[PDB]
Amino acid sequence: KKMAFTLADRVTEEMLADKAALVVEVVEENYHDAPIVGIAVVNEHGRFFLRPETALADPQFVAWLGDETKKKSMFDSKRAAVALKWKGIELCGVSFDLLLAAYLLDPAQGVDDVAAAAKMKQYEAVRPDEAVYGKGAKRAVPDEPVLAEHLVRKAAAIWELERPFLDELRRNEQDRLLVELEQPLSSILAEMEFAGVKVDTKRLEQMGKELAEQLGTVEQRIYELAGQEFNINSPKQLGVILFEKLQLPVLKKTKTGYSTSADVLEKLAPYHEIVENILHYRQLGKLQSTYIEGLLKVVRPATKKVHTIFNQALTQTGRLSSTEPNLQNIPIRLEEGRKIRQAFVPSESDWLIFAADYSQIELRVLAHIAEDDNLMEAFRRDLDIHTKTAMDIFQVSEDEVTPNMRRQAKAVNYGIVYGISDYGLAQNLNISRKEAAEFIERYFESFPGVKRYMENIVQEAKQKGYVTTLLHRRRYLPDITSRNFNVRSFAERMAMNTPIQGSAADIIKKAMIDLNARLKEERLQAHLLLQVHDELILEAPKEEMERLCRLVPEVMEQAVTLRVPLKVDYHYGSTWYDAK
DNA sequence: CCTGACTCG
DNA sequence: ATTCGAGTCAGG
Ligand SMILES: Nc1ncnc2c1ncn2[C@H]1CC[C@@H](COP(=O)(O)OP(=O)(O)OP(=O)(O)O)O1
Ligand SMILES: OC[C@H]1O[C@@](CO)(O[C@H]2O[C@H](CO)[C@@H](O)[C@H](O)[C@H]2O)[C@@H](O)[C@@H]1O
Ligand SMILES: [Zn+2]
Ligand SMILES: [Zn+2]
Known part of the structure; x- marks a missing residue:
């Protein structure tokens, strides 16, 4: 903890080497149109902190930023690339991204700052972001010298950590995963985010008005059916009305009290019509709060674009x-x-x-991975397994399969391959549990390759401590040897699902x-x-x-x-x- | 701030 | 307890 660096106030030639660690600091979580508060560079010639106004106004620095042949190592280059795009500057030549490298090595670590990545290699000459900028309403850029040392430390860490991370990725066969997949994808994502999506706000505002009327209507119907006014959006107040005042059966409790999940409410529909109205009310209420109001809060008023991250x-x-x-x-x-x-x-x-x-998609992936002949046969024959399963579940002909039944069949196909129990299936389709079990038994009968596969991948996970995808992405599952049935079962289903969803x-x-x-x-x-x-x-x-x-x-x-x-x-x- | 609701894949 | 992976919101 004693790092020499130049607090520069003009760009020099030795700051523009063709290989460097670069930090362009954006403290705002949402980096769209966000201020850049400082810049740091470490290379073979030294450690430099630059004030943004200086560096970004300098044609020579900007030219370097833009130059592909000049290699940069960074942490979260997409954040930098986008925050720069908003200032009209192009960033190229990013050859190593420490965020993505650490994420590939172990997604469970939840690495979201340089210090957390540094820890993976017991490198501690750098501090956590939060420790320097503070939390919540206290969040603030600290005094220049303190800021300067932090950015410089982050660049120095990136500089030291490249080889060791590339080393470990290479061992895991993830070197091309980083360099040929995640890193190039990062630039493409940056372009997508910057471009944004245009929104017809007059339309959105019109729907909001109509939605507010219909919400008012359903609301009042609900109070009438209930004999009382209450906060329908309070699972707590609602459970009192349902289970205490109206005396409906209690199908499920959670740690906090009576469950009022859609699953439970759908099951109570035979007892009282208020439940269908409540479901409808919550659907509409979500549309209005989130997809009208929330969406309108984040649209950029002059361009009418929304810029996701x-x-x-x-x-x-x-x-x-x-x-x-x-x-x-x-x-x-x-x-x-x-x-x-x-x-x-x-x-x-x-x-x-x-x-x-x-x-x-995932059924095709699983078919390749599990090498099930029936499944692969179903596919070279271009059947629609969703529609097929649908035909089976509702006992109907291809033409009587609504888009909605097909969506239900889809969750069943995926549910089973991903280890749904007889209970969950019976609960999902409101059917008998013995029936559910037999349906599953039948499914595995029909696709024994998939059955072998799921047994195998769980064994493998137990021996190795992790599973992998087609492109060698990895997920560690320590709990897979747990003595606890619940804990262990979760891990086993993760081992069934991750390779397929991850491959997709x-x-x-x-x-x-x-x-x-x-x-x-x-x-x-x-x-x-x-x-x-x-x-x-x-x-x-x-x-x-x-x-x-x-x-x-x-x-x-x-x-x-x-x-x-x-x-x-x-x-x-x-x-x-x-x-x- | 967490829970439980909704939304999608 | 009891397919998997996500984010946002109101209420508490
Ligand atoms: N209920 C689910 N359970 C588990 N995984 C799911 C579920 N729904 C979707 N997924 C995963 C698996 C398939 C992937 C893409 O979703 P999607 O709705 O496009 O399914 P699909 O590609 O099998 O069907 P479709 O032929 O209609 O595009 O997301
Ligand atoms: O640039 C996104 C990148 O930043 C991280 C942490 O550094 O997450 C931050 O930014 C997200 C997008 O704005 C926020 O949702 C998140 O809460 C915030 O910590 C990484 O998780 C992410 O890859
Ligand atoms: Zn699809
Ligand atoms: Zn899709």
């Missing part, structure tokens, strides 16, 4: 998440909610929304990198706006739709070669709603 270093399986706002959970399953999507529109005149989605996440990630290449290749103007786990959403000039219809599905289907083909459904239209 895709957290690339968060999920245990390798999936992305989306925050502030979450654009991966926009309603679709109920017609009333789905209309929210009419407000998501192209950013240019005469452009349209194109959307492409992997069909049955690997696949779409590679698909995105390839697609970006093929786009820029053919000089198409089309660009990615969103990823939603197994779908990609683009906007593009209407003329391009013809090209896209061949290109996007090809790229997505050929991103990897599996024992079975991949299938991509696609559609386009004037709004996200219409791309169906």
Whole structure:
């Protein structure tokens, strides 16, 4: 803890070496249009702190920032890249991202600052961010010298930690996972975030008014049915009305009291019609609070765009998440909610929304991985297993399978492969438990390869202490040897699920990198706006739709070669709603 | 601040 | 207790 560094006030030539650790500090969690509070560089010639106003106004520094041949090592380069994009500066030449490296080594660590990454190698010459900026309403940039030393320490850590992290990734066979997948993807995500998605706010505001009226109506119906006014949004007050005043049966309690989950309420529908109204009220209330009001709070008023942040270093399986706002959970399953999507529109005149989605994605992945002949046979024959299972569950013909039953069948197919118990299945479909068990038994009968697989991967997990995906992403499962049934069971189902969802996440990630290449290749103007786990959403000039219809599905289907083909459904239209 | 509700994959 | 992976919100 005694680090020499230059508190510079002008950019020098020795600050612009072709290999360096770089820190461009954004203290605001949401980095969109956020202030950059300081800059630090460590390279073969020394350690430098630069004030942003100086460095960013200097053509020589900016030129360096922009130069691909000049290699930078950073922590969370996407944060830097975007916060720079907002200041009109380009960042290139990022050859190592310590956030992504640490996330690949172990997602459970929840590394979200340099100090946490440093710890993985017992490097302690740097402090946690929170310790320097403080927490909550106390959060503040500290005095220049103190700030300066912190940024410099972070760059020095990055500088020291590159080789050792690359070393361990190399051992794990994750070196290409970092350098060829996560890092390139990071630039693509940065472009998507910066571009944003345009919102029809007049539409959103109109729906909000209508929603408020209907909410008022349902609310009053509920008080009438209840004989009393109460806070329907209080599971606590509600449970009193349901289970104490109306005396409905108690199907379930949690640590806090009576459960009023949708699952429970749906089961109580035979006893009292108030329950259906409550379910409807909470659906509508969510639409209004979150997808009208929340969405309107974060739209940028002059451009009418929303700029999400895709957290690339968060999920245990390798999936992305989306925050502030979450654009991966926009309603679709109920017609009333789905209309929210009419407000998501192209950013240019005469452009349209194109959307492409992997069909049955994880089932295809599992079929490749488990090498089940029946499943792989079902797929080379292009059956729709969701519809099929649906036909089975509701005892109906292909044509009597509504989009809604197909969604139920989907959770059942995935539920079973991912280790749902007879209880959960019976509870899910409100059917008999003995029936549930037999249905499962029958499922494994039908796909014994999948049955062998799930048994094997749990054994493997027990011996190795972790599982892996197609592209060698890894998840550690220490609890898999736990003496506790509950704890151990959770780990075992993680071992069943992670390799498949993680592989699917690997696949779409590679698909995105390839697609970006093929786009820029053919000089198409089309660009990615969103990823939603197994779908990609683009906007593009209407003329391009013809090209896209061949290109996007090809790229997505050929991103990897599996024992079975991949299938991509696609559609386009004037709004996200219409791309169906 | 946590829980339990809703939303999606 | 009892498929898996996420985020946001009101209420408490
Ligand atoms: N209920 C669920 N349980 C576990 N995993 C799920 C569930 N629903 C979705 N997933 C995971 C598995 C499939 C992946 C993509 O979701 P999606 O709704 O597009 O399923 P799918 O690709 O099998 O069906 P579709 O042919 O309609 O696109 O997300
Ligand atoms: O740039 C996102 C990156 O930052 C981390 C921690 O450094 O998370 C921060 O930023 C997120 C996006 O704004 C916030 O949701 C999060 O709460 C905040 O800590 C990483 O988790 C993430 O990869
Ligand atoms: Zn799909
Ligand atoms: Zn999808």
